[PDB]
Design a protein around this ligand. Structure first.
Ligand SMILES: [Mg+2]
Lengths: 524, 524, 524, 87
């Protein structure tokens, strides 16, 4: 595939045009009263949505290079959402603002590297200002308070979120399941979650979630990389007859074994998924065993002399539910014996006391938390299935905001916090004039999300922002009610973590584009 | 098919245009303050990188002839990295400068052959100047000193390099393995390295490395060329059943067996790799035997009457690790008995006594080193698996730099060494008037890497080059800190070998283009 | 299909353009300081060579008719290499000069038939001059002298060539084999060479050589034309288990068996080659038998009642090496017993008494020479494979030059010999005025290779040639050292046979083009 | 030629200033004020040219460093006087 190359302004201008298309389309849906965007669907009638993430997902440009601009922003914006749960659209809005003004500066004869440096300094100062601005969240009322707000002013949802965290801790693992009964249920059951993703995007049976949900699946524990389909065949045939899904944990799965399973799973016969074993080197051997004890399974080790091909249902572990997302795997309600698992914890507790290394005490302690802490599950109850499933989405959305709020506290969510920081460091400047311009670009860019909100609502952006500038603290304008006041008090806020992640990611992508002198793509 | 032919000025102009595109894109990332380059992918988003090598690999031009120019530079630049481990971007930078100014000279009516000679004379003088400029690196302090710098100021990485060399030797074999735990472990285990590449690129399971890593594979030793698939089958299925990779050492493998093994390995049945036996004639027979003793394997010889088809696992040697690169084969921790291995060494030591020829004593001595010297292995410790691969990559990069530093010492790495040498031989004149022009071209061209660094840093190339010229020795400008001083003492340097190799290759390709009178290619 | 036909000048002009393209691209690489050419590959990137033959192979033209001219010259030039071993580029150079001046003459309105004939007298007279100019090579000192020069100032290469001839004889059979060790080995072993080509070009396993080399292959001796694949099966299958290549000697092989074997040998199960038997009729029966005794194999005769299907391995002769080129087959180190081989010789020596004619005595004597004389072989010794194989190529070229040198002696190789002869017969005139024109065209065409040499070097051809003409005999200009004197003494010479063959082929092809009224080809 | 160069540098930098968010009318005033100050400095730097050699040097420098032109002109201006006419 032959490549087309553009330099300097020809390159940068195309990125600007590309980013603006993505940004302009996505920006309209940011506010409470945000405007809706029509997306075509290959089969059936066209889709109408107010969600920026959905719109961002659906945008790819005709012109390569312009496409690059949009996509570069999308990758980083997606990361903000993946690390914060919200602000995907906000990051893009901020990215456009920094990028559009920053590019003018490079084309004006000013040095791009200095402009980046000025912007980064502004961003660095802004992050700390956000930290001062931020209202901490630690007590149960604050947990419930943020949870109910996120949940769309439903106090019952906030209560369960706080209760879940209270039962397993702030860092504990909380999952959501369809409710069997009308009543909301919160339960503690043996289970474990670890940072391991799925080996294939093809495996996902829940496309909105992006996660794979399996029902009472068999669990295969392995201690070797799997490159050959042959080891799986006797076990593979056995699971299909059952009709139950099979989950595999091992070092890695190579394309020969994995490709057949991928093909077999997608609209095929036996639909199963495989994930990598948690931990590394020395760490994994103990952890796989922890999972084994938890699911009542048997670990298969090449070192032992036992191979996967010589295996039956007896060796496999079991759990009622398991869900696998892009980079995380969690198991729910493992079958392992209560005495076995509790005993395992006792063995580990004894292990903690050698305390030879701080790293080892903590790491052993970490093992205790995953196994002994268990997994807290929340079933969402409702009168009708339609209401029940809808409520479940809301609970999950509140949970991401609550976790972000816990880690860093909260800030005004109308884009007000960005406004608020910009007013505070207006005086800040750099020795190089180019640096001064970079600082101004970043600060001015911060204003955009507020203005975008107001613009979407059909109100004057300049008038609203000007009055907001006049105020102090968490004071701001709420788009939904057209009334000025403390945004946190009135119910509109964003986690401190999401605002920070969006703003800095936007600056990071912006800085990269500003310094770029060349882009490469294939011919039309 | 029918060919499109250009010759004389027309052929040279296209090469210039082709090389400039390649060089303009790659040159922007050379400095510590490297400019970002965005490389597109057909699916979704573009990528942003400061790595010149990744940029250069990707470049292919639609316009034939121009494409040849770019490719010609890429091949020679690639050779510099292949024989030095670094300077791929630097070679290209120097190549553009030499080629552009010299090429104009040939089109100006100047004799090309003389211009080459003038350029080469300046290049040769510069190489010796580099040798004088170069600071020796023999003691452990120097070994560690260069190793930590290359490792990007990591003192511990330098320490392991120095200690490994201290044991096995400068000429010894040092390899890097993923670490078992937090500590970095260095150990010497029985093993052997020889200069033999892999028969097929398709074999590589580590795409960034360009090498094939196998875990505790069975080893097949053969005394015949393998053109037929069929002999392999009884051993081939047996190894697959065993569940481990198979490594083959023999005279050579033909496409009849090679192509099927490739097909068999890529997304298929069993993934194994094969390499050619070390030495030739008398040497291979003794050398293969040394490997057999080392891996505890059995050699199969046509001359004896033994055949591959009749062989079993017990006839195969074993090692915990084996890695195969483009031109080198090495094995780690051979299973062969200490009594057998050490006893064989005694047999070889005894052989050395005959001293019939310097050639046999030299060669026998070489056998002793490989068989008895052993292999030094370095495990890289880390708190996380991602970090562990990260630290490991850095060690490998440092190791090439240390080996290069050992072989020829080191020079200032800011492009300063090229500057320093160019200034020293300003006076030098050729025979023909045209030759004198070539000399100026070569010397002026040398300036470019420094200027490029400064250009990438947003600083004036002419002003920095001018100040550097004024100073002497290793004195120069550090782009990263915007300061002037002794570049080696400031932690910025390049191995003498990489600087020399990049400068020599740039001149070699440049001269080559200069003397090229005709280009033939397919129509568009 | 409909075809494009053009007449006279229209047909001839296209041939002229075709030959000029081929000659212009090839001629630049003729000199010692020749200019390299860049050719592109489907498989990767471009490679550069100063070798005219490689350039010629890749030259094919867009315009049918022009392509034919180039191909016609390539055809004749290739033949010169085939019958001389060198001067493929020289033949092409001479062809362009003769053709351009002569072809213009036909275009003007001069008689073509006379022009060819006029050129022929020039050529015939020049060849006689070459014979007088030519220094004979008979003694060992001359043999070694030319051999070392051809090898490129390597005394050892020439010394072995002289020694090889000194053993088996000037007309004996000398072959080249890879060296098992450091020492160069020249020795004699039973073997036979005969003039027979390979049935299919597809058979060649050595594309640079254009020949098929096999390792200790089984030899099939047959007494019938082969038309049917079925007979082959029991023996073909037999060689397959053995794993060794199979060589076939028979009257001829038809497409029915030939096509399947060709497909079988390319990307197939058994890779074998087949050639026609030496001699014919009555002579053939004895000739095949001589090979049978030599190989120790059994000849299958239809007349007897023996059939190929009824054959086994014991009926197949063996030799350590066999090599087949475009029209010659030779075997090395036949396994046949010395007692039987010598005994076979005794039968032939006894036969000579029958001699009722000189032809029969001679023909029988020739048989004695092939069998009893044997084949001498050369193993090329070197420190490493790269040097060993590289050295081997040079030895083969020196060998061809020595055979050509022995058969006709040598002439100045700077193109000087053509210059010297052209100056000598300035006076010669034809009958018709048109014939006179042809003579001048041929005599000044002779100059072209010298001038081309000087042109490549970047020196003025007109100036060099004038001074060389002023001199006498072998006196001329050495392009490599920029000096004047005896070219032969200096180290630059061409075999008389190659110079003559190049010149005669150039004139032969030229005359055919001069006399070619019409051209017919496929549509574009 | 020199005047044109000044226009080139003034406008290139001035436009850059315009792109910097500055009021052009003010930029013009700044330029005009700087020029007024520069002229006075020029007035101070200027040294009277009264000798033949200096006049020759200006003629020679103007004539692209041609000595004969300066020599010929210096002789002329001296001979004709201050109000004399040279063509
Ligand atoms: Mg003037």
């Amino acid at each position: 595939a032959a490549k087309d190359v553009k330099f300097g302004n020809d390159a940068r201008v195309k990125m600007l045009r590309g980013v603006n298309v993505l940004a302009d389309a996505v920006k309209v849906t940011l506010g409470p009263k945000g405007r809706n965007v029509v997306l075509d669907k290959s089969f059936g009638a066209p889709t109408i949505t107010k969600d920026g993430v959905s719109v961002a997902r659906e945008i790819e440009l005709e012109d390569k290079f312009e496409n690059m601009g949009a996509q570069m922003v999308k990758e980083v914006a997606s990361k903000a959402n993946d690390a914060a749960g919200d602000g995907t659209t906000t990051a893009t809005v901020l990215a456009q603002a920094i990028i559009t003004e920053g590019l003018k500066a490079v084309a004006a004869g000013m040095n791009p590297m200095d402009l980046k440096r000025g912007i980064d300094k502004a961003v660095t100062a802004a992050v700390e200002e956000l930290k001062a601005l931020s209202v901490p969240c630690s007590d149960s009322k604050a947990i419930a308070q943020v949870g109910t707000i996120s949940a769309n002013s439903d106090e019952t949802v906030g209560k369960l979120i706080a209760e879940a965290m209270d039962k397993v801790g702030k860092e504990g693992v909380i999952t959501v399941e369809d409710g069997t009964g009308l009543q909301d249920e919160l339960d503690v059951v043996e289970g474990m979650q670890f940072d391991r993703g799925y080996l294939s995007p093809y495996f996902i049976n829940k496309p909105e979630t992006g996660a794979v949900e399996l029902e009472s699946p068999f669990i295969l524990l392995a201690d070797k990389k799997i490159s050959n389909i042959r080891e799986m065949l006797p076990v593979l045939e056995a699971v299909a007859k059952a009709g139950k899904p099979l989950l595999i944990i091992a070092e890695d799965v190579e394309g020969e074994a994995l490709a057949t399973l991928v093909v077999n799973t997608m609209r095929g016969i036996v639909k199963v998924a495989a994930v990598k074993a948690p931990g590394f080197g020395d760490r994994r051997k103990a952890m796989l065993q922890d999972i084994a004890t938890l699911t009542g399974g048997t670990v298969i080790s090449e070192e032992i002399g036992m191979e996967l091909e010589k295996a039956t249902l007896e060796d496999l572990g079991q759990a009622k539910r398991v869900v696998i997302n892009k980079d995380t795997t969690t198991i729910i309600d493992g079958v392992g014996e209560e005495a076995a698992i509790q005993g395992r914890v006792a063995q580990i507790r004894q292990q903690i006391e050698e305390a030879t290394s701080d790293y080892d005490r903590e790491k052993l302690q970490e093992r205790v938390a995953k196994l002994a802490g268990g997994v807290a599950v929340i079933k969402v109850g409702a009168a009708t299935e339609v209401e029940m499933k809808e409520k479940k989405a809301r609970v999950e959305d509140a949970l991401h905001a609550t976790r972000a709020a816990v880690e860093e506290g909260v800030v005004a969510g109308g884009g007000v916090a960005l406004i608020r920081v910009a007013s505070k460091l207006a005086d800040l400047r750099g020795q190089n004039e180019d640096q001064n311009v970079g600082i101004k670009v970043a600060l001015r860019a911060m204003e955009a999300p507020l203005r975008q909100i107001v613009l979407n609502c059909g109100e004057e952006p300049s008038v609203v922002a000007n009055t907001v500038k006049g105020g102090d603290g968490n004071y701001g304008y709420n788009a939904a009610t057209e009334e000025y006041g403390n945004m946190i008090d009135m119910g509109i806020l964003d986690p401190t973590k999401v605002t920070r992640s969006a703003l800095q990611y936007a600056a990071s992508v912006a800085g990269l584009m500003i310094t770029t002198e060349c882009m490469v793509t294939d011919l039309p």
